[PDB]
Amino acid sequence: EEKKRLHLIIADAELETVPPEILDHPAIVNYAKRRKKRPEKIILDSTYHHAALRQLEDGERRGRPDIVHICLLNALDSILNKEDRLRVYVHTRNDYVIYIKPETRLPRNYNRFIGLMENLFEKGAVPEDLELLRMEKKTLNELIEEINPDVVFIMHEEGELMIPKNFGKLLDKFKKPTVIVGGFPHGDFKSKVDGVKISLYREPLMAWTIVNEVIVSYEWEVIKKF
Amino acid sequence: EEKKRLHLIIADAELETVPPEILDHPAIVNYAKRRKKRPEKIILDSTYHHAALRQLEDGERRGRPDIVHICLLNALDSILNKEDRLRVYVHTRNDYVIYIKPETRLPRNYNRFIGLMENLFEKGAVPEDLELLRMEKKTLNELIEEINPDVVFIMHEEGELMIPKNFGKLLDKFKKPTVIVGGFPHGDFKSKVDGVKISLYREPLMAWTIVNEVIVSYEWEVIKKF
Ligand SMILES: Nc1ncnc2c1ncn2[C@@H]1O[C@H](CO)[C@@H](O)[C@H]1O
Ligand SMILES: Nc1ncnc2c1ncn2[C@@H]1O[C@H](CO)[C@@H](O)[C@H]1O
Ligand SMILES: O=S([O-])[O-]
Ligand SMILES: O=S([O-])[O-]
Ligand SMILES: O=S([O-])[O-]
Ligand SMILES: O=S([O-])[O-]
Ligand SMILES: [Cl-]
Ligand SMILES: [Cl-]
């Protein structure tokens, strides 16, 4: 825990159980009936639950646990992760953080991932002994305080434009760089924290693409055998 | 169609409708009843269908359409794709090929992706006019013949070890390099074609990780503004 590592936060993520406001919406009730599950225990998924989101605040961007899934598959299966050069976290839109042990094997199947998220939200930590995933009430600033990095970067389409290769070289100049990528499909961050905004392209990209550019660019600097 | 581009083939992919042999397996019948769908029309998914795979040849590696989904999300959302430097194809374990127009927006949600695959397998091309996805009976060699590349690389854990950065530099020395990545979770390729085997790491990696390493490494060579 003294070697250089990237601390990557997928932040303001659209990962939540079904909003209390819409628990009785027919599309929710029908879905939960079919799944034989209590609605309040179910992970919100706009693919199934869109009809119920029409009237919800930010309804159009909520319920995107797919973004976290694909980001985490990309991050945890990375060479950077295997070389013990990555720590990854999820901060959700409702100010919960998920801590992930680096050795975690995330379900490749999305539906199995959702099942895992349902278990995590219910029990607070999974599995019982290992606690490969652990969740608690926490703001993005509180998380950053815990990491105590020497620099915070916020990946932002409007930030300082950098060639991805060059951003990797920049990250390798720090001991404990934190990079924040939004876990939401469009719009602004909800959590304004101090950090350096960095663009890698002058068009919007998906979170997983940004994850890949950052991780791969860093890999080729920080792993001396590369 | 004269600029350098990477032609990326996700090959021998575990993407198929339910095997004829197991259509009457209870786990298949129950699943298809629940989905109100004809079993033969359903995409095989080991997450739901594993009980029926126990006795099938290669049962343990079949029904992994998740691998294709995550590979294609990674490929199509890439900067390389946006710069018109990528052509991507799927060749399946049953000798079908899927051609993908570069502008295709793949469903981010896995279950919506499966629905799209069901439609594609049924109709041969989707959507009706656009034909962003098109499928036909075809071997991997026949596909390579169509591409007519100046080099074929086969990403293989046992191949010539290369630093990913350096493989990108190598790819940029060709006009029309084809790269093959297996779309199967473990084991050997089924389709032996002529090509140069390249390892990027001396441990096994998932297909999507290899996809990211290849695409990102190439990007930083082939896109002159990088
Ligand atoms: N062009 C871009 N450069 C850098 N980060 C980006 C870009 N497009 C999107 N992102 C990041 O991905 C998230 C999801 O699109 C955004 O909240 C942001 O963190
Ligand atoms: N270490 C590796 N180097 C290169 N390609 C690999 C490696 N591990 C797996 N692959 C590729 O990913 C596919 C799925 O693991 C394999 O069939 C192969 O194409
Ligand atoms: O059955 S309820 O606890 O999901
Ligand atoms: O990893 S499991 O979801 O196939
Ligand atoms: O209803 S059957 O055609 O899937
Ligand atoms: O892109 S759709 O699957 O959310
Ligand atoms: Cl929540
Ligand atoms: Cl098939």
Classify A93 as helix, strand or coil.
coil
Q: What pairs with residue A197 in β-bridges?
A: A154
Report d(CA A23, CA B165) in Å as an integer: 50
Tokens of B43: 């995409």
- Please report the residues numbered 30 through 49 in chain B whose beta carbons come closer than 8 angstroms to any beta carbon of chain A: 45-47
User: Cα(A122) to centroid of ligand 8, in Å?
Assistant: 39
Residue pointed to by tokens 């084809």: B178
- Measured from the Cβ of residue B150, the count of other Cβ atoms closer than 10 Å reads 11
A30, containing H or E segment: helix A26-35
Residues A210 and A67: beta-carbon distance below 8 Å? no
Which residue among B110, B209, B220 sits closest to A164, beta carbon to beta carbon? B220
- Return the exposure string of B159-191: e unless at least 16 CB atoms fall within 10 Å of the residue's CB, then b: eeebbbbebbbbbbeeebbbbbbbbbbeeeeeb
How far apart (Å, rounded) are the C-alpha atoms in residues B220 and B226?
6
**Cβ-based neighbours of A87, under 8 Å, separated by 6 or more:** A5, A6, A7, A8, A102, A147
Domain A6-15+63-222, CATH class in plain words? alpha beta
Residue B134 burial (C-beta neighbours within 10 Å; 0-12, 13-18, 19+): middle
**B201: nearest Cα among B157, B167, B160, B166:** B157
In whole angstroms, what is the distance from residue A11 CA to residue A100 CA? 14
Pairwise CA distance, residues A83 & A165, whole Å: 19
Pick from A61, A49, A54: nearest CA to A23: A49
| Conformational region of residue B97, where left means phi above 0, alpha means psi within -120 to 50, and beta covers everything else | beta
Residues of chain B with CATH 3.40.1280.10: 6-15+63-110+129-222
The three-state secondary structure class of A182 is strand
Q: Which of A46, A70, A206 sits opposite B70 (nearest CB)?
A: A70
Residues of chain A with CATH 3.40.1280.10: 6-15+63-222
Whether B223 and chain A come into contact, CB under 8 Å, resolves to no
The bridge status of strand B196-199 relative to strand B152-161 is parallel
Inform me whether the C-beta atom of residue A165 falls under 8 Å from chain B C-beta atoms: yes
Min CA distance, B23 vs chain A (Å)? 22
Q: Is the dihedral of CA B138, B44, A78, A149 positive or negative?
A: positive
Alpha carbon of A3 to those of A173, A200, A222, B6, B131: distances in Å? 12, 26, 10, 36, 50
- Residues B139 and B96 sit within 8 Å (Cβ to Cβ): no
Instruction: Name the residue in chain B with its Cα closest to that of A109.
Output: B66
- Mention every residue, 6+ apart, whose C-beta is less than 8 A from residue A116: A106, A107, A126, A133
DSSP structure string for A116-177: HHHHHHHHSEESTTT-SEEEEE--HHHHHHHH--S-EEEEEEEEEE--HHHHHHHHTTSSS-
Give the length of chain A.
Answer: 226
Strand order in the sheet with B196-199: B125-126, B133-137, B96-100, B86-92, B6-13, B178-182, B152-161, B196-199
Structure tokens at A185: 């499909």
- Residues composing chain B: 226
Place of tokens 């997928």: A10
Cα of B181 vs its chain's centroid, Å: 7
Report residue B78 as tokens.
């890439």
SS3 for A70? helix
- Tell me whether residues B110 and A108 touch, CB distance under 8 A: no
Pairwise CA distance, residues A199 & A182, whole Å? 13
Tokens found for residue B53: 């795979």
Give the contacts of B134 (CB within 8 A, at least 6 positions apart). B98, B99, B124, B125
Q: Give the architecture-level CATH label for domain B6-15+63-110+129-222.
A: 3-Layer(aba) Sandwich (3.40)
- Max alpha carbon distance in chain A (Å)? 56
How many Å apart are CA A133 and CA A116, to the nearest integer? Answer: 10
Q: Ligand 1 centroid vs B101 CA: distance in angstroms?
A: 24
Which element (helix H / strand E) includes A219? helix A207-222
Indicate the SS3 state at residue A43: strand
Q: How far is the CA of A47 from the centre of ligand 6 (A)?
A: 7
Residue with tokens 């991780």: A215
A50, A191, B11, B199 from B214: Cα distances, Å: 36, 34, 15, 11
> Which helix (H) or strand (E) is A198 found in, with range?
strand A196-199
**The Cα angle at residue A206 between residues B63 and A219, in degrees rounded to 5:** 85
* Residue nearest (by alpha carbon) to ligand 3 atom 1: A37
Residue A67's closest chain B neighbor by CA?
B108
How far, in Å, are A51, B8, B58, B201 from residue B204 at the CA level? 42, 19, 19, 7
d(CA B37, CA B30): 10
User: Which experimental technique did the depositors report for determining this structure?
Assistant: X-ray
Q: Phi/psi class of residue A103: alpha, beta or left (left: φ > 0; alpha: ψ in -120 to 50)? A: alpha
SS (H, E, C) chain B: CCCCCEEEEEEEECCCECCHHHCCCHHHHHHHHHHCCCHHHCECCHHHHHHHHCCCCCCCCCCCHHHHHHHHHHHHCCHHHHCCCEEEEEEECCCEEEEECCCCCCCCCHHHHHHHHHHHHHHCEECCCCCCEEEEECCHHHHHHHHCCCCEEEEEEEEEECCHHHHHHHHCCCCCCEEEEECCCCCCCCCCCCCEEEECCCCCCCHHHHHHHHHHHHHHHHCCCC
Which contiguous run of DSSP H or E holds residue A73?
Answer: helix A65-76
Task: Tell me: cis bond preceding B127? Omega within 30 of 0 counts.
Answer: yes
Q: Partners of B196 in the beta sheet? A: B153
Residue B201 assigned to a binding site: yes
Q: Chain B interface, mutation test: which of A108, A218, A226, most B Cβ atoms within 10 Å? A: A108
DSSP code, position A192: -
A134 burial (CB, 10 Å; 0-12 / 13-18 / 19+) is middle
Q: How far is B142 from chain A (nearest CA, A)?
A: 31
